Amino acid sequence: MLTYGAPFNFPRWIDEHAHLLKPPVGNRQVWQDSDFIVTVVGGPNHRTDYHDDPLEEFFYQLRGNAYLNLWVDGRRERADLKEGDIFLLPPHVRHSPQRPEAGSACLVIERQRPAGMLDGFEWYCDACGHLVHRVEVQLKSIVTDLPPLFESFYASEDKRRCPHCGQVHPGRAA
Ligand SMILES: [Cl-]
Ligand SMILES: [Fe+2]
Numbered sequence: 001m002l003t004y005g006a007p008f009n010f011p012r013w014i015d016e017h018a019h020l021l022k023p024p025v026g027n028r029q030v031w032q033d034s035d036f037i038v039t040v041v042g043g044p045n046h047r048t049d050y051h052d053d054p055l056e057e058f059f060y061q062l063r064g065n066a067y068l069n070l071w072v073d074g075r076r077e078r079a080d081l082k083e084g085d086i087f088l089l090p091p092h093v094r095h096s097p098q099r100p101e102a103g104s105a106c107l108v109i110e111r112q113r114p115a116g117m118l119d120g121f122e123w124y125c126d127a128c129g130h131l132v133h134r135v136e137v138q139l140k141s142i143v144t145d146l147p148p149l150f151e152s153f154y155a156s157e158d159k160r161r162c163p164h165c166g167q168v169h170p171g172r173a174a
């Protein structure tokens, strides 16, 4: 049977879920309990964490513009997701998506992770660039698994303290 229902109009779905595609929620998963995790991500949202995804991530910036802060070949880089852009991120490339525009919408597609395949979330020192803190998580449900992780980082000057230069990371904002 059609476990995930019939086809439906995507722009209309996005318009209908617009109140969820802005703070405080910011994103909405299209289908539940599927192998492909299909999400629409709105804005505005800025963040300081880098994601280490053990699988690929596909992006299609449908409305508005956004960008990814990246670590590529040991250097800080930026990949712009201009409206209309698509992009495929290889596994383990550290990325911190920034979504400055209200009313923006990006299709993001990921895969469910098998047991034992973990995701990393990392923060880096603004002063010297050294890794400050890394948490590894078996990512089953983004909504329950992720906010407390970020919250525990922000609340702890110990976790935010750079092991190299001693500078305390600013936490939630930079
Ligand atoms: Cl994103
Ligand atoms: Fe990611």
Ligand SMILES: [Fe+2]
Pocket (backbone or CB within 6 Å): 125, 126, 127, 128, 129, 130, 162, 163, 164, 165, 166, 167
């Ligand atoms: Fe540092």
